[PDB]
Scaffold this active site. Structure first.
Site, PDB file in Angstrom:
ATOM      1  N   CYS A   1       0.870  -1.186   0.000  1.00 26.16           N
ATOM      2  CA  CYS A   1       0.000   0.000   0.000  1.00 26.16           C
ATOM      3  C   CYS A   1       0.906   1.236   0.000  1.00 26.16           C
ATOM      4  O   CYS A   1       1.757   1.356   0.901  1.00 26.16           O
ATOM      5  CB  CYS A   1      -0.850   0.026   1.301  1.00 26.16           C
TER       6      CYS A   1
ATOM      7  N   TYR B   1      -5.692   5.643  -9.185  1.00 33.68           N
ATOM      8  CA  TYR B   1      -6.844   4.770  -8.851  1.00 33.68           C
ATOM      9  C   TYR B   1      -8.133   5.205  -9.587  1.00 33.68           C
ATOM     10  O   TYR B   1      -8.996   4.403  -9.884  1.00 33.68           O
ATOM     11  CB  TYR B   1      -7.109   4.772  -7.344  1.00 33.68           C
TER      12      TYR B   1
HETATM   13  N1  LIG Z   1      -6.165   7.804   4.246  1.00 41.00           N
HETATM   14  C1  LIG Z   1      -5.659   6.479   4.495  1.00 41.00           C
HETATM   15  C2  LIG Z   1      -5.763   5.634   3.237  1.00 41.00           C
HETATM   16  C3  LIG Z   1      -5.220   4.234   3.438  1.00 41.00           C
HETATM   17  C4  LIG Z   1      -5.868   3.344   2.415  1.00 41.00           C
HETATM   18  O1  LIG Z   1      -6.778   3.824   1.600  1.00 41.00           O
HETATM   19  N2  LIG Z   1      -5.478   2.081   2.381  1.00 41.00           N
HETATM   20  C5  LIG Z   1      -5.978   1.069   1.474  1.00 41.00           C
HETATM   21  C6  LIG Z   1      -4.744   0.429   0.891  1.00 41.00           C
HETATM   22  S1  LIG Z   1      -4.531   0.839  -0.829  1.00 41.00           S
HETATM   23  C7  LIG Z   1      -6.666  -0.040   2.188  1.00 41.00           C
HETATM   24  O2  LIG Z   1      -6.152  -0.584   3.264  1.00 41.00           O
HETATM   25  N3  LIG Z   1      -7.801  -0.486   1.677  1.00 41.00           N
HETATM   26  C8  LIG Z   1      -8.563  -1.574   2.234  1.00 41.00           C
HETATM   27  C9  LIG Z   1     -10.022  -1.431   1.987  1.00 41.00           C
HETATM   28  O3  LIG Z   1     -10.450  -0.359   1.541  1.00 41.00           O
HETATM   29  O4  LIG Z   1     -10.709  -2.424   2.257  1.00 41.00           O
HETATM   30  C10 LIG Z   1      -4.236   6.701   4.799  1.00 41.00           C
HETATM   31  O5  LIG Z   1      -3.755   7.724   4.378  1.00 41.00           O
HETATM   32  O6  LIG Z   1      -3.598   5.900   5.450  1.00 41.00           O
END
Ligand SMILES: N[C@@H](CCC(=O)N[C@@H](CS)C(=O)NCC(=O)O)C(=O)O
Ligand SMILES: N[C@@H](CCC(=O)N[C@@H](CS)C(=O)NCC(=O)O)C(=O)O
Lengths: 307, 308
Positions: free
Chosen positions: A43, A175
C-alpha cells in the site's frame, strides 16, 4: 466494509508530552516499546509510514506487522504464507478488521492500512498515514530519533499545496484511472495523471526535490506512487502513455530516494505486484501478474551533485 | 463463439494463374478481374497480411474488400457499419460474417474467422488461411498486371519458412498465448518467449535491412503485422509489457520503414485495432476501456535505406 460492528463482503496524535493533537484524544505520549504499525508492503499510503520510520530512525521505538498482500473477501488478512508477511505478531488475530473491532466494536467504515496501534491501551491511535508521518517527524526527538524535519514551518504552506494536487491528480489519480466506470471518466483521470507528471518533471528539473533542495514529506508522498507506477499502474491501471523511466527528472528522483540508506529494504515488489494484480478481480479477472516493465533503480542518478 | 452443424453458439483452395488446383482443395479458381473479394477486419493481424500483399502486388483492380465492424461480440464478426471504415457486406448485405460460411456449407462446424477470400462467381469461400492467401496474391495475378515482386522467391524459401515457424509460434501467436493465458505459469512461459524472440529479431535486424537480407519477404510482412499492434495493444492489453517496440533501435526502425512504404499506412487503422481488442475481449478486459496508449510516432525518418 465494517457495518455497525460486523464484516460485510481514528484521528488521535502520538505526542511528545501526551497532550492531544489538533484532533482526537490525548494520552498517547511518545515512548519506547508501546507503539506498533500494521501495514501492507503493497500500500503506498502505508509505505509512507515505513519510509518515515527508517529516515527518523524509529526502528527501536516502533515494531511492525505486515498483512498478506492478497486482499480478498475478508479485506486485509494475517495469513502468513507469503514471504515477509509476518502474521499479527502482537495478538495473532486472523483479520485486520479484528483490531478495528477490538478498538470499537460498533465501528462503521473501511478497514485500511496503515494502523498506528497502542499496545498499552490496546487501541488505535491513528489510521491516517498523512498524520502518522507528522507524528514520526518530531514526537520521538527527545527520545533519540535521527535528526530531520520533513514538515518544517517555512515549507509547510508549499508542502500542503503540493500534497493537495499530488494527492488528487497522482496518488489517488491513478486509482481513478484504474477503477474508472466508463471510458469518459477514464480519459479524464489519465489525462490528469500525465499532465501532473509533466508538471512534476519541470519542477524536478529546477532543484533536487519538490520544494527546493530539502527532502520533505511531499516528496515521500509522491515517491510511494512513483515507485509503484511502472511495476503496476502503467499496465494494471492503464496509465500507459509513458513510463516513469521515460522522464529524466522523475526517474532520477525515483532512484535518488530509492537509494537512500534503508529505503530499498522498505520496497517489496513481490507484495506490490501480487496485491494489485491478484486482488483487483473486477479489472484483472484472470489474476495474472504481468512480467512488468524493465527498470533498474540501482543505476547512479547524480541528482546529489547536479543540485 | 463458433458454428456447430450450421448453428451459431478449413477452406483451403488456391487461386492460381491457370485454374489448376493448388496443393489442397479443388481447381477452378483461376485469377481474373471482378471475381474475388476479401472479407477482413482492420484489427486482425492475419487479415492485415492480405491487405498488405494486395497493396504491394498492385491488386486493387482485382480484389475488392469489405471490412467488418471491429467489435466482435455475441454474434462473432458482424457487418454493422456504424464505425468509420467499417463497410458492411458490400456484396450481399449480410448481417454476420457467419452467414458467409453457412452459404459455403449450410451445416458448417468451426470458427468464423477473417480474412475470407471469397469467390463472387461461385458464391463460395476460396480460402480463409492468410498464410496461403498471401502466396496466391504473390504470383497468381502476375500475367494480369500485378506489380513485379516475389515475397517468397525460390532461393529464400527455406530461410523464410524457418523464420515463419518460430515467429509464428513465439510472436504472432505468442502474444495471444500470453494475453489469454489461464494460469501464471503459462503466461510466464509465453511472455518470456515473446521477449526472447524480440531480442533475437533485434540482433537480426541489426545486420541488414530486413529479416533475410536486403530484400523484403513475406516473413517480414508477417512479423510486421504483429509489431504494428504491439505498442497500441499487446503491451498493455496482453500484458507483454517488459519492453515497448519503440525501445528497440532496429525493430522500431523496421516498424517505421515498412509503415512508410507507399500504400502501407492506409492499411493501418488504429481506431479499429484498439477498439477491437480492448472492447471485444471481455474475459480479459471486463470494463472495455481502451487505455490512452503508449506514445509513439511512426512518421519519423528511419535511415534504414542507407545504413546498410
Ligand atoms: N487515508 C488512508 C488511506 C489508506 C488506504 O486507503 N489504504 C488502502 C490500501 S490501498 C486499504 O487498506 N484499503 C482496504 C479497503 O479499503 O478495504 C491513509 O492515508 O492511510
Ligand atoms: N489461420 C487463420 C487465422 C485467422 C484468425 O485466427 N483470425 C481471427 C482474427 S484476429 C478471428 O477472426 N477470430 C475470430 C474467432 O476466432 O472467433 C489465418 O491465418 O488467417
Amino acid at each position: 466494509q465494517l457495518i455497525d460492528g460486523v464484516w460485510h463482503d481514528f484521528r488521535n496524535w502520538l505526542t511528545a508530552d501526551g497532550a492531544p493533537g489538533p484532533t482526537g484524544t490525548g494520552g498517547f505520549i511518545a515512548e519506547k516499546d508501546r507503539y506498533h504499525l500494521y501495514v501492507s508492503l503493497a500500500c503506498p499510503w502505508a509505505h509512507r509510514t515505513l519510509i518515515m520510520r527508517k529516515l527518523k530512525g524509529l526502528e527501536p521505538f516502533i515494531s511492525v506487522s505486515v498483512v498478506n498482500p492478497l486482499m480478498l473477501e475478508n479485506g486485509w488478512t494475517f495469513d502468513d504464507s507469503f514471504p515477509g508477511a509476518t502474521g499479527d505478531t502482537l495478538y495473532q488475530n486472523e483479520f485486520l478488521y479484528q483490531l478495528y473491532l477490538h478498538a470499537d466494536p460498533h465501528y462503521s467504515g473501511r478497514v485500511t492500512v496503515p494502523v498506528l496501534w497502542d499496545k498499552k491501551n490496546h487501541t488505535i491511535v491513528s489510521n491516517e498515514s498523512a498524520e502518522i508521518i507528522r507524528m514520526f517527524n518530531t514526537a520521538f526527538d527527545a527520545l533519540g530519533a535521527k535528526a530531520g524535519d520533513y514538515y518544517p514551518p517555512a515549507l509547510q504552506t508549499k508542502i500542503d499545496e503540493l500534497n493537495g494536487w499530488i494527492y488528487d491528480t497522482v496518488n489517488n489519480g491513478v486509482y481513478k484511472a484504474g477503477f474508472a466506470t466508463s471510458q469518459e471518466a477514464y480519459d479524464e483521470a489519465v489525462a490528469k495523471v500525465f499532465e501532473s507528471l509533466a508538471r512534476l518533471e519541470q519542477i524536478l528539473g529546477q532543484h533536487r526535490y519538490l520544494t527546493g533542495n530539502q527532502l520533505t514529506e511531499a516528496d515521500i508522498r509522491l515517491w510511494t506512487t512513483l515507485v509503484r507506477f511502472d511495476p503496476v499502474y502503467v499496465t494494471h491501471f492503464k496509465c500507459d502513455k509513458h513510463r516513469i523511466s521515460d522522464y529524466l527528472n522523475l526517474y532520477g528522483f525515483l532512484r535518488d530516494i530509492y537509494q537512500m540508506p534503508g529505503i530499498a529494504e522498505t520496497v517489496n515488489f513481490d507484495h506490490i505486484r501480487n496485491h494489485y494484480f491478484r486482488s483487483h478481480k473486477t479489472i484483472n479477472p484472470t489474476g495474472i501478474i504481468s512480467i512488468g516493465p524493465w527498470q533498474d533503480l540501482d543505476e547512479p542518478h547524480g541528482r546529489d551533485v547536479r543540485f
